Design a protein around this ligand. Structure first.
Ligand SMILES: Nc1nc2c(ncn2[C@@H]2O[C@H](COP(=O)(O)O)[C@@H](O)[C@H]2O)c(=O)[nH]1
Length: 186
């Protein structure tokens, strides 16, 4: 039951690594489903990817102390709840939290959770830029901000804040590392 917090910039293939994990070990791990006020994307199931809540409900959740941690990103709110983590743990599975660097810093400050920290790094920031540009979705201005956030995360990883850093420069290789880390148990 030590929760594993996984973080890393989007574009690293991080969702595919976890997709594989939950495919191979469906009865061993439970995902912490965060609440968010952003709008759902095609493919996302409310209650599975996120619990999509209004701003009035997310404010009520803040005032009633329902979060382990919460942040804002691009004007929308996101947070991990006490009740989603508690339900996975009482099911008897290992809780996995997929959160950003602000979320990592916050859970670091909660000794009680006793979490493990795994960071999934891009091959390099230049490579991340190529993937984000190759998607065609982002603008010059959002990509620049994402690269600046990924540089801040890599500098924070060199303080020794995570228990393990995986460089995802090949999915199957990073997936073998991820399972080696996890099933080591501590
Ligand atoms: N701190 C924190 N960050 C989160 C949480 N859920 C998702 N994030 C993040 O906020 C960003 C946006 O996620 P997206 O909108 O793509 O699903 C990503 O950096 C992702 O890691 C949460 O519960 N807490």
């Amino acid at each position: 039951s030590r929760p594993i917090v996984i973080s890393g910039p989007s574009g690293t293939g991080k969702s595919t690594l976890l997709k594989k994990l939950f495919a191979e070990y469906p009865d061993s791990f439970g995902f912490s489903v965060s609440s968010t006020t952003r709008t759902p994307r095609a493919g996302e199931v409310n209650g599975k990817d996120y619990n999509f809540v209004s701003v009035d409900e997310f404010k009520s959740m803040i005032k009633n102390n329902e979060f382990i941690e919460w942040a804002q990103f691009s004007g929308n709110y996101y947070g991990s709840t006490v009740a989603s983590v508690k339900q996975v743990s009482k099911s008897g599975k290992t809780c996995i939290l997929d959160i950003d660097m602000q979320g990592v810093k916050s859970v670091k400050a909660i000794p009680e959770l006793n979490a493990r920290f795994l960071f999934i790094a891009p091959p390099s920031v230049e490579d991340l830029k190529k993937r984000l540009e190759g998607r065609g979705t982002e603008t010059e201005e959002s990509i620049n901000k994402r690269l600046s956030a990924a540089q801040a995360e890599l500098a924070y990883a060199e303080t020794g804040a995570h228990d393990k850093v995986i460089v995802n420069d090949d999915l199957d290789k990073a997936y073998k590392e991820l399972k080696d880390f996890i099933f080591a148990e501590k």
